[PDB]
């Protein structure tokens, strides 16, 4: 009985999370430029300071 | 009187051996079923964690 209850609860949780991932991937293609933007910003500050 | 007690002992002993054999078979089937379900639980838990 315990195991039945636990599996049911987890299945419900898995569906909820799948709906949230589908909304987030429509935004991400452009990530290949992060480390480069951070270093660029850091460099600009260092130059000013 | 000694013959009667021996007959009782025979009945009880027979019942006992018969019950024990059938109980061991159930326990083994039960534990197998629990392990199978537990394994399913474990796979779902890992997938949920990765998504989170």
From TrEMBL, chain A:
<protein>
    <submittedName>
        <fullName>HAUS augmin like complex subunit 6 L homeolog</fullName>
    </submittedName>
</protein>
<feature type="coiled-coil region">
    <location>
        <begin position="1"/>
        <end position="37"/>
    </location>
</feature>
């Amino acid at each position: 009985q315990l195991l039945i209850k636990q599996i049911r609860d987890m299945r419900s949780e898995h569906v909820a999370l799948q709906n949230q991932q589908k909304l987030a991937e429509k935004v991400d293609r452009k990530i290949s430029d992060k480390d480069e933007n951070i270093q660029k910003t850091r460099c600009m500050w260092n130059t000013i300071m | 009187m000694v013959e009667m007690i021996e007959s009782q002992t025979l009945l009880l002993t027979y019942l006992t051996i018969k019950m024990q054999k059938n109980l061991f078979r159930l326990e083994e089937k039960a534990e197998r079923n629990l392990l199978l379900v537990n394994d399913q639980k474990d796979q779902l838990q890992e997938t949920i964690h990765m998504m989170k």
